[PDB]
Amino acid sequence: GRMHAPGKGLSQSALPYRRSVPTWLKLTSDDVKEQIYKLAKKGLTPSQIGVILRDSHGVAQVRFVTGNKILRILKSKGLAPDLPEDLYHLIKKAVAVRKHLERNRKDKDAKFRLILIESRIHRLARYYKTKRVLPPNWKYESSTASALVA
Amino acid sequence: MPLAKDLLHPSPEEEKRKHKKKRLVQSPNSYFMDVKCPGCYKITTVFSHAQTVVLCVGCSTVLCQPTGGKARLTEGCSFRRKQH
Amino acid sequence: VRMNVLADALKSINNAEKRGKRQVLIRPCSKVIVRFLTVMMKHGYIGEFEIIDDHRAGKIVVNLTGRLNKCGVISPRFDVQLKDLEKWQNNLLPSRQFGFIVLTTSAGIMDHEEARRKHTGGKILGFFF
Amino acid sequence: MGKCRGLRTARKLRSHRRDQKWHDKQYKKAHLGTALKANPFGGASHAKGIVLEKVGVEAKQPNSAIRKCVRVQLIKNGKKITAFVPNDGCLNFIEENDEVLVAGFGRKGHAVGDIPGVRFKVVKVANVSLLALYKGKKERPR
RNA sequence: GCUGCAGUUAAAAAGCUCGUAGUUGGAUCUUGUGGAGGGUUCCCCGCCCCUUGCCUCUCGGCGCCGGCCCGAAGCGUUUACUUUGAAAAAAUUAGAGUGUUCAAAGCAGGCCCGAGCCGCCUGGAUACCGCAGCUAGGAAUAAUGGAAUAGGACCGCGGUUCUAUUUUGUUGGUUUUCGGAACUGAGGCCAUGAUUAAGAGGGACGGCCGGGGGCAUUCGUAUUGCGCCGCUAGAGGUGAAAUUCUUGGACCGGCGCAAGACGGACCAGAGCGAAAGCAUUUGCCAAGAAUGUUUUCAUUAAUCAAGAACGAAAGUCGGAGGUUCGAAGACGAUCAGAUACCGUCGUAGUUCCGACCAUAAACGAUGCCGACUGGCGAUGCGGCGGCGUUAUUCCCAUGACCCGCCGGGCAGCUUCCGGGAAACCAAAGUCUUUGGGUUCCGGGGGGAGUAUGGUUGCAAAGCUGAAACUUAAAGGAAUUGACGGAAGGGCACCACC
């Protein structure tokens, strides 16, 4: 199951077989696009974007009112970020850990957990960088972690 | 198990009370709802597990509340599914 | 993980037949499992079977009888060259008279008895009897 | 079971077996050759020596007897081996400071029967067998 | 022990986790009809769109009546696999033929005629030859391939540049033309190009949960010491004693203060943590599991040489502290002896801060990941459903109790699931009907974790690790006896009172 904990668990989303509209709805493909573009200005990232549509607007999902994903729509403009938010959130966490570690050198538990989250960055990086989604010279270090999260 | 039981055609909710990814076809256990209370006279549509505060444009500015699952509504009826 | 799908499949229908059952549920439905069970149905060891459809990969349900004694998998997949054949079938079958080693060839998936008449070797998958 | 069954795992099989074969007792003696160096034989079936002097060797319990062996130095190594003498009165047909021919018991490394410390026996005194000396179809050539 | 072994207790899973190499890895991209070969549909030509994908042609044949048609020429993105050919010294081996007197062998030999035939007939096969390389057919299986910041299609045109040497009979000066090649713009034509989201993983989001960790802070009683007050003779301790303590007074009772240590009862086959481990208050700092979700990414995974973090107690080095307990040591008893068990005193240590040390019955003596296969009642956490009591503000905020359902977690009970030598175990099950993936490790008992060299450490030692020689038993589970300064009953003047 879990990749750095021993646990096992199910909580996965389950989609219906259907996939019409379904009937009840509005905002033709085009309407949904301009509704999205406004949100990305405000710093709402693709995961947040689909949530804020699904909770309060008439969409089931933005993959059955468009022929594309949420991210590809943003990418066609050129307004997509230069690294995926997934990678960003890993790096975002580990800097605060390193701050706490400098403030407290006797928190061996934090030091331990850092080894996991550190190694999990490098594995993820080796997906993107082989697929030509990152430069083949980019590496993860303390210095590059500081600058890239800011 | 009686060790001979059917699995082709299940009971409407005595063999569809199971976990949603242990059913023959995967179904959600969630639904939408068409609302329109008074605090905000508009036909709003909202998902059952809100996950975030749904805002109002009327006198009120809150409609929901995200808890650990479904979402606690408020003093405004407005209910439907519809169909799904 | 679920490295090999076919290998996890047969053990269910093997276990189920022993206890005394006649309906099962096997997932996640590979095309390879379909053509296997087609050959196994012709000879008469199982009955008609229903493929449920999902977008994920499907699920299959089978109707079976006590005629089956055991179907096993042989993994990893070795080659046969129609002189290696006699050595394989001796070890894996209760008798010369019946039992059916299955394999895949460029002429499709079939029993060993058919492959010998087409002069086709290939990769072995499992067996049954 | 409990081990790899890959299709490209020929290396991981043939290197494992080559290591775990050395834990066998038999194999480890044959191929190191420490057998040859330690033995008073060169691996030869027999060997030849010259008598040093008769001895009496006590038996291991329950049995009690005196077993009348010899002790011998070898021609080609100069090291010493303690060797049993067979049937009754055959001790007399071995005389001190002559040559003899030795041979293993028939257990190929280990001391046999109730006699300890002996791993060798004696077959010919001087081109004449213990049999023909014992039975009386030959006589001492001296 | 690849086919084909074993690791709970018999020899045996690294203390634990991370991690590169290595090995292994989800689903998904075409079916019917006449003729021919075989049944009663089904397995060489074609047909629906495809059918050995195409063209373009031009040179050397086949045609039919200048004109037209179809074989050979480039090939279908690349491999493994499989099938057919080629090419493989003899002897040996398998094996055909042959009456060696039969045989082991050997390669021979057999026929008709008085010689008068001047001769006749016949053999000296065939198979096999790991690989790798060479050749041709198949297209299932397993890898690999393409247009998503567009270029595929057509003589579509422009802009720009280079070049080919043929012909006007030939040879020279010039210029276009034709062919090849290279580069640029704007426009048509494509159904104009994205498989799903694994009861795989990662990531976001929401409300919670826990003696999880770090830092700060707060509190309780006891113990010991000190001061003061009161009464008077013994007090400690043991099986029985004694050392020891005591009229400058102990022990005991009362009151206040100080020091250090420590978190009772509550506290449980309960919870959290990778393991080692983790219980007074309150706050701060970062972290994590489970559950909920019609959110996001789209195979990003599994297990692991190298290498890396953490790792009880004791011990070592440098500082602080030192109540309590206490190796060492000094005494008192018990004992023939008593360097012990027991009593008194007591150093190191025990505590904290900073460096080392890497080991334990670090034990569930039981690798990790995945699938399938009985029943029943509970408990901790989240979510959902419900005839009701119950809290408050009088009334569906969310609290407590009751009933049921769905996840994942610590466990239990039950049996001809099945297994095991048995003890036992829903896993140690799905194993002679043996193959899901992968790491580590074992080979009779001693010698020996010794010898030796390497490496790490200040020290203590840790890791890595033989042989000579010796021996027929060592060891596991279970059963019957005997025995017990084991437990429960009963009995005797050869037992006691």
Tab-separated table of C-alpha atoms (C1' of nucleotides) in Angstrom, chain E residues 132-485:
chain	number	residue	atom	x	y	z
E	132	A	C1'	26.517	-17.826	-32.378
E	133	G	C1'	26.305	-16.517	-37.562
E	134	C	C1'	23.551	-17.209	-42.778
E	135	U	C1'	17.948	-17.964	-45.292
E	136	A	C1'	12.620	-17.874	-45.850
E	137	G	C1'	7.307	-18.079	-43.694
E	138	G	C1'	4.026	-16.805	-39.395
E	139	A	C1'	2.090	-12.260	-36.284
E	140	A	C1'	-0.409	-14.719	-31.056
E	141	U	C1'	2.757	-13.616	-26.943
E	142	A	C1'	6.866	-10.086	-24.729
E	143	A	C1'	9.872	-5.391	-25.629
E	144	U	C1'	10.393	-0.936	-29.105
E	145	G	C1'	8.051	3.075	-32.749
E	146	G	C1'	4.844	7.995	-34.408
E	147	A	C1'	1.257	14.684	-35.529
E	148	A	C1'	-0.290	18.145	-28.893
E	149	U	C1'	4.438	24.683	-28.814
E	150	A	C1'	1.888	20.171	-35.764
E	151	G	C1'	2.612	18.055	-40.543
E	152	G	C1'	0.298	14.187	-42.954
E	153	A	C1'	-2.189	14.565	-48.217
E	154	C	C1'	-2.559	16.939	-53.740
E	155	C	C1'	1.142	18.516	-60.358
E	156	G	C1'	-1.772	23.565	-54.659
E	157	C	C1'	1.324	28.486	-55.817
E	158	G	C1'	4.977	32.174	-54.367
E	159	G	C1'	9.614	33.918	-52.688
E	160	U	C1'	15.077	32.331	-52.808
E	161	U	C1'	19.521	29.501	-54.156
E	162	C	C1'	22.491	25.911	-56.042
E	163	U	C1'	23.382	22.375	-59.656
E	164	A	C1'	22.875	18.413	-63.857
E	165	U	C1'	25.213	18.078	-68.820
E	166	U	C1'	21.839	16.628	-73.156
E	167	U	C1'	19.709	18.465	-77.636
E	168	U	C1'	19.475	22.701	-82.462
E	169	G	C1'	24.733	17.073	-87.646
E	170	U	C1'	29.832	18.285	-85.369
E	171	U	C1'	33.052	21.896	-82.739
E	172	G	C1'	33.309	27.060	-79.953
E	173	G	C1'	30.358	32.190	-77.765
E	174	U	C1'	25.693	33.177	-75.393
E	175	U	C1'	20.354	32.445	-73.458
E	176	U	C1'	16.350	30.006	-71.885
E	177	U	C1'	14.424	25.070	-71.299
E	178	C	C1'	14.516	20.155	-68.668
E	179	G	C1'	16.054	17.327	-64.466
E	180	G	C1'	18.006	16.990	-59.449
E	181	A	C1'	18.721	19.647	-54.786
E	182	A	C1'	18.159	23.400	-51.031
E	183	C	C1'	15.717	27.008	-48.406
E	184	U	C1'	10.560	30.964	-47.510
E	185	G	C1'	5.784	32.910	-47.060
E	186	A	C1'	0.175	33.013	-47.122
E	187	G	C1'	-4.184	29.670	-48.413
E	188	G	C1'	-7.163	24.810	-49.206
E	189	C	C1'	-7.850	19.141	-47.775
E	190	C	C1'	-7.653	15.403	-42.677
E	191	A	C1'	-14.134	13.321	-38.364
E	192	U	C1'	-7.552	17.695	-38.722
E	193	G	C1'	-4.168	14.276	-34.131
E	194	A	C1'	-4.793	13.204	-26.545
E	195	U	C1'	-7.619	4.998	-24.890
E	196	U	C1'	-9.094	4.466	-19.653
E	197	A	C1'	-8.148	6.157	-14.284
E	198	A	C1'	-6.260	-0.078	-12.091
E	199	G	C1'	-10.949	-2.472	-5.209
E	200	A	C1'	-1.911	0.279	-8.344
E	201	G	C1'	0.967	4.626	-6.691
E	202	G	C1'	1.943	10.039	-5.946
E	203	G	C1'	-0.298	14.947	-4.861
E	204	A	C1'	-4.204	18.598	-3.326
E	205	C	C1'	-8.702	19.423	-0.170
E	206	G	C1'	-12.156	18.676	4.610
E	207	G	C1'	-13.390	17.417	9.445
E	208	C	C1'	-11.094	14.529	13.195
E	209	C	C1'	-7.706	11.157	16.099
E	210	G	C1'	-3.484	9.400	19.158
E	211	G	C1'	1.058	8.062	26.905
E	212	G	C1'	4.062	9.887	18.389
E	213	G	C1'	8.490	13.605	18.561
E	214	G	C1'	10.991	18.542	19.931
E	215	C	C1'	11.051	23.131	23.031
E	216	A	C1'	9.108	26.024	27.012
E	217	U	C1'	6.119	25.992	31.492
E	218	U	C1'	3.141	24.218	35.668
E	219	C	C1'	1.843	20.577	39.823
E	220	G	C1'	1.601	16.458	43.559
E	221	U	C1'	2.953	13.177	47.343
E	222	A	C1'	6.849	10.504	49.184
E	223	U	C1'	12.174	9.976	50.466
E	224	U	C1'	16.465	12.208	52.643
E	225	G	C1'	18.715	16.326	55.305
E	226	C	C1'	18.221	20.723	58.424
E	227	G	C1'	15.931	24.037	62.242
E	228	C	C1'	12.214	24.415	66.155
E	229	C	C1'	8.503	22.320	69.605
E	230	G	C1'	6.411	17.814	72.999
E	231	C	C1'	6.836	13.080	75.620
E	232	U	C1'	10.572	9.503	77.701
E	233	A	C1'	13.927	4.325	76.583
E	234	G	C1'	14.671	1.656	73.758
E	235	A	C1'	15.153	1.761	68.193
E	236	G	C1'	16.956	-0.880	63.480
E	237	G	C1'	16.660	-6.072	61.562
E	238	U	C1'	15.964	-11.525	60.798
E	239	G	C1'	13.890	-17.891	60.142
E	240	A	C1'	16.383	-16.854	64.876
E	241	A	C1'	20.550	-12.891	65.584
E	242	A	C1'	24.310	-9.410	65.621
E	243	U	C1'	26.960	-5.349	63.362
E	244	U	C1'	24.719	-0.341	63.841
E	245	C	C1'	21.781	3.707	66.284
E	246	U	C1'	20.499	6.142	71.693
E	247	U	C1'	19.409	10.790	77.920
E	248	G	C1'	24.480	16.539	73.812
E	249	G	C1'	17.029	12.621	73.425
E	250	A	C1'	17.213	8.119	69.290
E	251	C	C1'	12.737	5.974	67.499
E	252	C	C1'	7.837	8.464	68.044
E	253	G	C1'	4.164	12.989	67.507
E	254	G	C1'	3.620	18.328	65.825
E	255	C	C1'	5.318	22.834	62.737
E	256	G	C1'	8.347	25.187	58.906
E	257	C	C1'	12.410	25.049	55.302
E	258	A	C1'	16.001	22.970	51.696
E	259	A	C1'	17.999	19.216	48.080
E	260	G	C1'	17.647	15.647	44.620
E	261	A	C1'	14.817	11.838	42.575
E	262	C	C1'	9.998	10.421	40.644
E	263	G	C1'	4.846	10.698	37.979
E	264	G	C1'	0.909	6.173	42.039
E	265	A	C1'	-4.228	4.286	42.381
E	266	C	C1'	-6.876	5.785	37.786
E	267	C	C1'	-3.808	2.306	33.549
E	268	A	C1'	-6.988	-1.988	30.110
E	269	G	C1'	-5.244	-9.549	25.521
E	270	A	C1'	-6.613	-0.268	25.221
E	271	G	C1'	-3.773	3.665	21.827
E	272	C	C1'	0.417	5.841	18.949
E	273	G	C1'	5.599	4.899	16.670
E	274	A	C1'	9.873	1.979	11.310
E	275	A	C1'	12.088	-0.311	15.431
E	276	A	C1'	14.390	1.007	19.982
E	277	G	C1'	10.182	3.036	22.712
E	278	C	C1'	6.176	6.573	24.724
E	279	A	C1'	1.620	8.308	30.928
E	280	U	C1'	1.165	15.206	36.279
E	281	U	C1'	-0.509	20.943	33.871
E	282	U	C1'	-0.642	24.506	30.004
E	283	G	C1'	1.335	26.785	25.599
E	284	C	C1'	4.344	26.852	21.302
E	285	C	C1'	7.105	24.238	17.098
E	286	A	C1'	7.216	20.985	13.042
E	287	A	C1'	5.227	15.569	11.655
E	288	G	C1'	1.798	11.237	10.662
E	289	A	C1'	-2.209	7.255	10.125
E	290	A	C1'	-7.258	6.119	9.127
E	291	U	C1'	-11.786	7.877	6.969
E	292	G	C1'	-14.686	11.228	3.578
E	293	U	C1'	-14.562	13.245	-1.787
E	294	U	C1'	-18.638	12.583	-9.138
E	295	U	C1'	-10.860	17.059	-7.193
E	296	U	C1'	-5.627	16.550	-9.548
E	297	C	C1'	-1.480	13.588	-12.173
E	298	A	C1'	-1.554	9.323	-15.695
E	299	U	C1'	2.001	4.002	-14.724
E	300	U	C1'	5.042	7.801	-11.799
E	301	A	C1'	5.415	0.473	-9.103
E	302	A	C1'	7.313	-4.056	-6.067
E	303	U	C1'	11.823	-6.134	-3.676
E	304	C	C1'	16.679	-4.823	-2.965
E	305	A	C1'	24.440	-5.678	-3.555
E	306	A	C1'	26.734	-0.537	-2.975
E	307	G	C1'	25.759	3.327	0.425
E	308	A	C1'	22.741	5.987	4.533
E	309	A	C1'	19.573	7.425	9.300
E	310	C	C1'	17.728	5.757	13.997
E	311	G	C1'	19.139	1.899	17.508
E	312	A	C1'	17.575	-0.628	25.183
E	313	A	C1'	20.867	-1.481	29.271
E	314	A	C1'	26.001	-1.632	30.511
E	315	G	C1'	30.781	0.674	29.214
E	316	U	C1'	34.514	4.955	27.642
E	317	C	C1'	36.045	10.603	27.376
E	318	G	C1'	35.111	15.888	29.066
E	319	G	C1'	31.785	19.199	32.380
E	320	A	C1'	27.470	19.817	35.983
E	321	G	C1'	24.947	17.152	39.900
E	322	G	C1'	24.865	13.219	43.544
E	323	U	C1'	18.354	12.432	47.212
E	324	U	C1'	17.654	7.193	46.301
E	325	C	C1'	19.258	2.529	45.120
E	326	G	C1'	24.061	0.377	44.582
E	327	A	C1'	28.760	-3.555	41.181
E	328	A	C1'	33.630	-2.956	44.104
E	329	G	C1'	35.080	-2.849	49.097
E	330	A	C1'	34.733	-3.136	54.912
E	331	C	C1'	31.760	-5.564	58.536
E	332	G	C1'	27.647	-9.004	61.151
E	333	A	C1'	25.550	-13.822	60.706
E	334	U	C1'	24.401	-18.926	58.504
E	335	C	C1'	27.739	-23.143	57.134
E	336	A	C1'	32.565	-28.576	58.483
E	337	G	C1'	34.038	-24.840	54.745
E	338	A	C1'	30.700	-19.891	52.682
E	339	U	C1'	35.098	-15.134	48.688
E	340	A	C1'	27.514	-16.703	48.310
E	341	C	C1'	21.854	-16.487	49.322
E	342	C	C1'	20.376	-12.919	54.379
E	343	G	C1'	21.435	-7.991	57.741
E	344	U	C1'	24.479	-2.978	58.355
E	345	C	C1'	27.804	0.521	56.016
E	346	G	C1'	29.505	2.093	51.138
E	347	U	C1'	32.879	3.842	46.001
E	348	A	C1'	32.152	3.690	40.760
E	349	G	C1'	27.483	3.949	38.541
E	350	U	C1'	22.377	5.559	38.879
E	351	U	C1'	20.685	11.887	37.051
E	352	C	C1'	21.630	16.137	33.333
E	353	C	C1'	24.729	18.488	29.099
E	354	G	C1'	28.309	17.527	24.812
E	355	A	C1'	31.203	13.468	22.222
E	356	C	C1'	31.935	8.007	21.496
E	357	C	C1'	30.314	2.540	21.630
E	358	A	C1'	26.345	-0.666	17.589
E	359	U	C1'	25.354	-5.035	20.821
E	360	A	C1'	20.260	-8.204	23.590
E	361	A	C1'	15.664	-14.248	24.427
E	362	A	C1'	16.814	-6.265	19.966
E	363	C	C1'	11.295	-13.084	20.213
E	364	G	C1'	5.257	-13.336	17.424
E	365	A	C1'	12.178	-17.382	18.367
E	366	U	C1'	7.348	-16.687	12.460
E	367	G	C1'	10.873	-11.376	5.663
E	368	C	C1'	8.380	-7.783	2.496
E	369	C	C1'	4.369	-6.907	-1.545
E	370	G	C1'	-0.225	-9.225	-4.070
E	371	A	C1'	-4.604	-12.738	-5.029
E	372	C	C1'	-8.184	-16.513	-3.351
E	373	U	C1'	-10.665	-19.582	0.594
E	374	G	C1'	-15.716	-20.714	6.916
E	375	G	C1'	-18.726	-19.081	11.021
E	376	C	C1'	-19.598	-15.736	15.647
E	377	G	C1'	-19.355	-12.084	19.369
E	378	A	C1'	-16.461	-7.709	20.993
E	379	U	C1'	-13.068	-3.337	21.307
E	380	G	C1'	-10.346	1.549	19.470
E	381	C	C1'	-10.949	5.463	15.100
E	382	G	C1'	-13.635	7.709	10.856
E	383	G	C1'	-18.109	7.863	7.838
E	384	C	C1'	-23.469	6.653	6.928
E	385	G	C1'	-28.702	4.838	8.367
E	386	G	C1'	-32.192	4.817	12.170
E	387	C	C1'	-38.334	3.204	17.142
E	388	G	C1'	-36.477	6.151	21.143
E	389	U	C1'	-34.795	8.089	26.215
E	390	U	C1'	-30.927	12.449	27.552
E	391	A	C1'	-28.021	17.864	27.732
E	392	U	C1'	-29.409	23.114	27.016
E	393	U	C1'	-32.069	28.230	25.136
E	394	C	C1'	-38.379	26.383	24.826
E	395	C	C1'	-37.240	24.398	20.093
E	396	C	C1'	-33.746	18.899	14.098
E	397	A	C1'	-26.200	23.677	16.271
E	398	U	C1'	-22.694	19.012	17.798
E	399	G	C1'	-22.672	16.359	23.225
E	400	A	C1'	-23.690	11.582	26.109
E	401	C	C1'	-26.647	6.224	26.010
E	402	C	C1'	-29.428	2.532	22.482
E	403	C	C1'	-29.725	-0.305	17.421
E	404	G	C1'	-27.891	-1.399	12.532
E	405	C	C1'	-24.545	-0.732	8.208
E	406	C	C1'	-19.516	0.370	5.488
E	407	G	C1'	-13.846	0.876	5.720
E	408	G	C1'	-9.098	-0.096	7.626
E	409	G	C1'	-6.474	-1.557	13.051
E	410	C	C1'	-4.958	-4.433	18.006
E	411	A	C1'	-7.059	-9.186	19.419
E	412	G	C1'	-10.398	-13.422	20.924
E	413	C	C1'	-13.848	-17.616	20.530
E	414	U	C1'	-15.629	-21.749	17.437
E	415	U	C1'	-14.729	-26.574	13.434
E	416	C	C1'	-13.549	-33.307	9.625
E	417	C	C1'	-11.607	-25.409	5.402
E	418	G	C1'	-6.826	-27.376	4.549
E	419	G	C1'	-1.999	-28.249	6.303
E	420	G	C1'	1.706	-30.376	9.952
E	421	A	C1'	6.137	-35.355	12.817
E	422	A	C1'	3.194	-33.500	16.500
E	423	A	C1'	2.556	-29.447	19.510
E	424	C	C1'	-0.507	-26.339	16.853
E	425	C	C1'	-1.864	-22.639	12.727
E	426	A	C1'	-8.021	-18.915	8.670
E	427	A	C1'	-2.583	-19.291	8.145
E	428	A	C1'	2.604	-22.087	9.351
E	429	G	C1'	-3.833	-22.910	4.237
E	430	U	C1'	-4.542	-22.976	-1.597
E	431	C	C1'	2.429	-28.362	-2.436
E	432	U	C1'	4.665	-35.201	-5.859
E	433	U	C1'	-2.339	-32.394	-8.973
E	434	U	C1'	5.005	-29.371	-7.014
E	435	G	C1'	6.155	-22.599	-11.067
E	436	G	C1'	2.365	-14.933	-8.658
E	437	G	C1'	7.047	-11.265	-7.755
E	438	U	C1'	11.767	-10.765	-4.848
E	439	U	C1'	15.608	-10.349	-0.964
E	440	C	C1'	18.297	-12.857	3.013
E	441	C	C1'	19.876	-17.630	4.819
E	442	G	C1'	20.686	-23.498	6.093
E	443	G	C1'	23.658	-28.860	5.047
E	444	G	C1'	25.323	-34.784	11.312
E	445	G	C1'	27.575	-33.469	16.489
E	446	G	C1'	32.264	-31.134	18.275
E	447	G	C1'	36.888	-28.280	17.152
E	448	A	C1'	35.094	-22.391	17.168
E	449	G	C1'	32.957	-17.323	16.852
E	450	U	C1'	38.652	-20.062	18.141
E	451	A	C1'	43.100	-19.536	14.599
E	452	U	C1'	44.745	-15.885	10.769
E	453	G	C1'	44.915	-11.494	7.797
E	454	G	C1'	41.647	-7.164	6.696
E	455	U	C1'	38.660	-3.121	8.749
E	456	U	C1'	36.349	0.222	12.527
E	457	G	C1'	37.087	2.081	17.779
E	458	C	C1'	40.654	6.662	22.652
E	459	A	C1'	39.494	2.273	25.553
E	460	A	C1'	36.249	-2.088	26.047
E	461	A	C1'	35.495	-4.583	21.652
E	462	G	C1'	32.429	-4.944	16.984
E	463	C	C1'	32.121	-6.783	11.818
E	464	U	C1'	34.249	-10.124	8.348
E	465	G	C1'	35.930	-15.821	9.600
E	466	A	C1'	39.015	-21.370	8.645
E	467	A	C1'	41.622	-26.054	9.136
E	468	A	C1'	44.136	-30.108	11.333
E	469	C	C1'	42.063	-33.625	14.458
E	470	U	C1'	37.845	-36.232	16.864
E	471	U	C1'	33.034	-38.904	17.184
E	472	A	C1'	27.629	-42.284	16.140
E	473	A	C1'	25.209	-39.773	17.931
E	474	A	C1'	23.623	-34.720	19.142
E	475	G	C1'	18.507	-32.597	18.682
E	476	G	C1'	12.628	-31.961	18.128
E	477	A	C1'	7.453	-33.369	19.349
E	478	A	C1'	4.490	-36.742	21.789
E	479	U	C1'	3.222	-41.369	25.139
E	480	U	C1'	3.832	-44.728	29.270
E	481	G	C1'	6.410	-45.299	34.089
E	482	A	C1'	9.438	-43.762	38.174
E	483	C	C1'	11.046	-39.414	40.969
E	484	G	C1'	10.014	-34.189	43.044
E	485	G	C1'	12.858	-30.005	49.925
